[PDB]
Write a protein that binds this ligand. Sequence first.
Ligand SMILES: O=c1ccn([C@@H]2O[C@H](COP(=O)(O)OP(=O)(O)O)[C@@H](O)[C@H]2O)c(=O)[nH]1
Ligand SMILES: O=c1ccn([C@@H]2O[C@H](COP(=O)(O)OP(=O)(O)O)[C@@H](O)[C@H]2O)c(=O)[nH]1
Ligand SMILES: O=c1ccn([C@@H]2O[C@H](COP(=O)(O)OP(=O)(O)O)[C@@H](O)[C@H]2O)c(=O)[nH]1
Ligand SMILES: O=c1ccn([C@@H]2O[C@H](COP(=O)(O)OP(=O)(O)O)[C@@H](O)[C@H]2O)c(=O)[nH]1
Ligand SMILES: [Mg+2]
Ligand SMILES: [Mg+2]
Ligand SMILES: [Mg+2]
Ligand SMILES: [Mg+2]
Lengths: 296, 299, 288, 307
Amino acid sequence: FQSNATIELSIVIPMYNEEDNLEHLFARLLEVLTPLKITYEIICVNDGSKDKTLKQLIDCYQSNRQIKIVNLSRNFGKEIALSAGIDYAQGNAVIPIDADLQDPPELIHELVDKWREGYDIVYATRRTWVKQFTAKMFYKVIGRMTEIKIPPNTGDFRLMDRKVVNAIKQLPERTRFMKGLFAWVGYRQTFVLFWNYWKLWNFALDGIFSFSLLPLKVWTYLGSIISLLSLAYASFLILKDVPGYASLMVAILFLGGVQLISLGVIGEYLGRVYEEVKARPLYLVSDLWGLEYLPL
Amino acid sequence: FQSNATIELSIVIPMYNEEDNLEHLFARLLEVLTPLKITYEIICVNDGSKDKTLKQLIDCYQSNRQIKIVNLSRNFGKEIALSAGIDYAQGNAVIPIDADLQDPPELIHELVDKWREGYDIVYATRRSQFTAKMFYKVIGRMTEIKIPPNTGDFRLMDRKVVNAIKQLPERTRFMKGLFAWVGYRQTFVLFDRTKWNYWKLWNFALDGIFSFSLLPLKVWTYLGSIISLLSLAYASFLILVDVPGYASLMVAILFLGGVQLISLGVIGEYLGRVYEEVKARPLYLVSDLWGLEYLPLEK
Amino acid sequence: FQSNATIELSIVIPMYNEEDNLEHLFARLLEVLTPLKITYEIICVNDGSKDKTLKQLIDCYQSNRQIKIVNLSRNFGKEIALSAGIDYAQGNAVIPIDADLQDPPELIHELVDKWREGYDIVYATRRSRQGMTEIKIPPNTGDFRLMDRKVVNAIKQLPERTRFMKGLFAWVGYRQTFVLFDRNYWKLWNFALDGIFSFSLLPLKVWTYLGSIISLLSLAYASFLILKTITLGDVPGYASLMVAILFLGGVQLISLGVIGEYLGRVYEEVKARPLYLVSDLWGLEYLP
Amino acid sequence: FQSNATIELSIVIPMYNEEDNLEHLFARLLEVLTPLKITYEIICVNDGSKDKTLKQLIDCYQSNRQIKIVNLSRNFGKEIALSAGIDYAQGNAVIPIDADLQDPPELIHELVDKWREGYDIVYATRRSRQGETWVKQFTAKMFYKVIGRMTEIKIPPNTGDFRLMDRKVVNAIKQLPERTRFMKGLFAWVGYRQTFVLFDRNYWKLWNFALDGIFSFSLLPLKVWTYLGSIISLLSLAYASFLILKTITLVDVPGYASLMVAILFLGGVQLISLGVIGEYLGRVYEEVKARPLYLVSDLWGLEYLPL
Ligand SMILES: O=c1ccn([C@@H]2O[C@H](COP(=O)(O)OP(=O)(O)O)[C@@H](O)[C@H]2O)c(=O)[nH]1
Ligand SMILES: O=c1ccn([C@@H]2O[C@H](COP(=O)(O)OP(=O)(O)O)[C@@H](O)[C@H]2O)c(=O)[nH]1
Ligand SMILES: O=c1ccn([C@@H]2O[C@H](COP(=O)(O)OP(=O)(O)O)[C@@H](O)[C@H]2O)c(=O)[nH]1
Ligand SMILES: O=c1ccn([C@@H]2O[C@H](COP(=O)(O)OP(=O)(O)O)[C@@H](O)[C@H]2O)c(=O)[nH]1
Ligand SMILES: [Mg+2]
Ligand SMILES: [Mg+2]
Ligand SMILES: [Mg+2]
Ligand SMILES: [Mg+2]
């Protein structure tokens, strides 16, 4: 009869219009977390639902000490409402879970076991020439574990140690932790076994611009050397071949073309500077049930 | 009788050259606030008045425990002088009121009524075509707050809303779009008795798409880049089809020279917004305070 | 008889190679501050002097309780060394003066009298001759002024406190007055242009609208006014090509000038390096 | 004997795949620090090593109270792993040393001697008299005008990575992201009391850092080009307004000789304006980014920051 006051595991569940599944969600999770003999909590983030999902949450909160509600002021999205629950999650390990149980909750028993071996981040991965080209370009930077990338694998069902949650707590990229932040932070990582390449390589471009200044730096010197090769081609060649229209239009279309993507890479990084300096917060909490406001 | 050390309501009245209306304003407010039987405070923000308005404020301060003065260092904006009073206003609900008193102060009896029901932001809009059908689907579900014949400047905000926007520079222009972003429980009450111009309302729709979004900068970067690869590839292909001479040489140099100027506009616009976000300069400066304490110098 | 804990007045002196003036500066200052019957402190900021200025300062520090030394790591300039002196200066009023006494210390008695009346900022501007406030063109108000504690705290975190006379004095407001005493026009509007960029943003928005509307008058003229009149099969080509490339190619450079001007100000606001570095302190405490 | 609570010296060593050198490193260092009779600590930064370097550090940690370990989450640069150790190093003086022992550790006796004399920064530049040429005299004269008499700590065949720093200096640059490249210009900007100690035991990267210095510690590359770019804009604007106001004629002057050059000159100066603007924009992103400089996975013999 020892009353333990420390929380070991946190289950963060972003929910938007999940009124029917609330009965099957909390019940199936209970038969998985009970045999673990580990103190836990369930953080339920209300993402501005209309179908009275909040009223049904307060009923589960009223008869379950492990149910805690984070009511958002409006609909902010899955990635943002999930970050809201992790901020209010004060456990040693954090496991985000979808409400429709697309992944089996029994994998929590497999996530916590590999977590107690020393690994700080534990993933859960399911199982033409584009499949051989994409898988080869990424192993040169991602590292040992790239199976979380190849479709239809998404690392949205994972376990993270408290050290990883606090590290990326102040980073605006914590909303899209799978967009590349997982590979930058490193730590001890592993996974357990159990699409659309147009959007897969859209993250490849979004990752090069976010974690690197190469697109801006490379085109700065590339756009500078062709400016020196420019001004020199009319410096010594003005004291006096002249194809006329065969190069008056070409130079107008070339020198004017290289500037448009120079303004493109500048406007891209400028928009990223605004996102980093803006004072507008990521989300707003309307009400809280079973939790305290932040900062504590 | 017992005492109470918690303020429940805070009204904020920015004042510039309001030497005349002080006697009628406080008398009118007292006959409205006293029947509520609720603890309140009155924040009067002297915004660099020149007609001895402050000298009359201090006299009202001396004889009324509810009067609290925030004297600014110089004359700032009416929106700025309003944010100063909200920063120094304690209490669970904040409602700013004007000094000319175009809207009846008795309307606060119903802003507080909808606030007790659970609504966090309660507007007071006056009663009186394609644009209204536009904003109802993209901007806000309650377009009646920012209608031409009435602006939502007479409103009541809960403490949770005041604290959430305390650090945002957009709190100066809360009606310029920030109200549609914060969410929360919103509702309005309807009443009857420059602005109101349609060019000034779409200026609010233009100032909003740039403040709360990156689309004007993102859609133009991708657009200016795809026309750039068309410009450099068609130039290489033209340097090895039809060569219309002046019918293309004048058009091309004048098209690229014009698309770069608008590209420089969206960059210079967002650069000015990045600048205003990183300034260490505050919105206002407080010269003197009556019945209040200074804010922590951390800021 | 009895002790006093709070300091009322603070005199801040930036010092660079002032080994000689120290005997005459402290003696003449004591002759003016003593009849005031007001507790005071003297903050001396050593701005990397090459001579024996610091050694003579510590000697005056040993035999005078009102002398306090702020030793900067290297030379940072008169403006930065003066901002450092005010940062370490406690006291309801702050009066900065120079070591070479072009500013007569006897004006301190007149600046403190205007401050007693309620003025928050009292300037000491030299008389002009030659051929409110706004004395910023002939000799003009220098760094000789009085500022209440409320003013120095308001602009403490502001980087513009270094150049307080370049425009920040007109932005802060407060109760201001000046005092006249005796004994280039290019720098006039160089500082007037330095102010219209820091406290306005209008030079950026005015050229954004002007640069965009002439981009509308531009694009529309050749997109389908030239395309609609030449689709049938024109203005003097060379006369129209030269006037187009040099009007459009040049207005972009002014757009690049204002954008590059405001980009540098963003870099100065967000840079993490400090304005100065203190090497040693005498009779003071470190910040924060 | 009695106990002392203040640490006088802090030795920081970044370590990446130094499994073999750990035995000789701690042994040779202990024979240099023991005669000093001052309290010291050794901060070891595990910069994501791949072999068993961390396993051997913990054993040395288990039998030496001066050994302290900072295990980074992954492999960063040498400049980053060294800044991580300085953050966790507590002591009146800080001396960074390499693990492969490229410079003799007996110079610590000379660095501490110059530190107690009042110098806040004490360098240890190698004494090399070879390579004296006209290019070595031009760079020396150009760098002496901004760095000072101390500028001798950066000859081509040596740097200033072996140095002593007082606590006042490591605190002054603690929050500065330029602390990693401290020997890229930041040393000349702080301007504390500096000196060096001599011992005997490329020009591409020298002027590449001199170009990286005028952009980092100045705005001249941006301010000079905006003024130079605006004055040649007035020259192109007025000269064009007069060429179009010259109505005393009507097919071409210098036709393709000047018009092809005009689009060329005005099109090249903009690319240089875009270069300096994009360069400083990337610097603004590096200053405002919330992403940290490193991440600590585990600590041995230390506490997490802030204290
Ligand atoms: O706007 C949204 C949409 C998603 N969700 C939650 O995020 C999870 C995503 O599940 P869904 O099946 O709707 O998306 P998908 O499975 O395709 O990723 C669900 O538990 C939702 O409750 C949310 O909180 N806000
Ligand atoms: O510089 C100013 C201008 C206005 N006001 C206050 O804001 C209100 C503006 O009233 P006005 O009739 O001019 O604006 P409107 O009634 O149309 O909102 C007045 O009550 C003033 O007290 C102010 O504090 N400072
Ligand atoms: O690099 C400098 C130059 C100026 N000063 C101080 O600033 C004051 C102004 O002196 P200066 O004659 O050079 O300026 P001016 O008289 O021309 O205004 C003097 O007391 C100096 O001690 C300084 O601290 N560091
Ligand atoms: O990626 C790296 C490379 C360097 N080092 C450390 O930094 C020092 C540099 O050693 P190296 O000989 O490789 O560099 P150099 O001697 O040429 O300066 C070594 O002690 C390493 O332990 C590190 O921690 N991470
Ligand atoms: Mg699902
Ligand atoms: Mg009015
Ligand atoms: Mg002088
Ligand atoms: Mg080595």
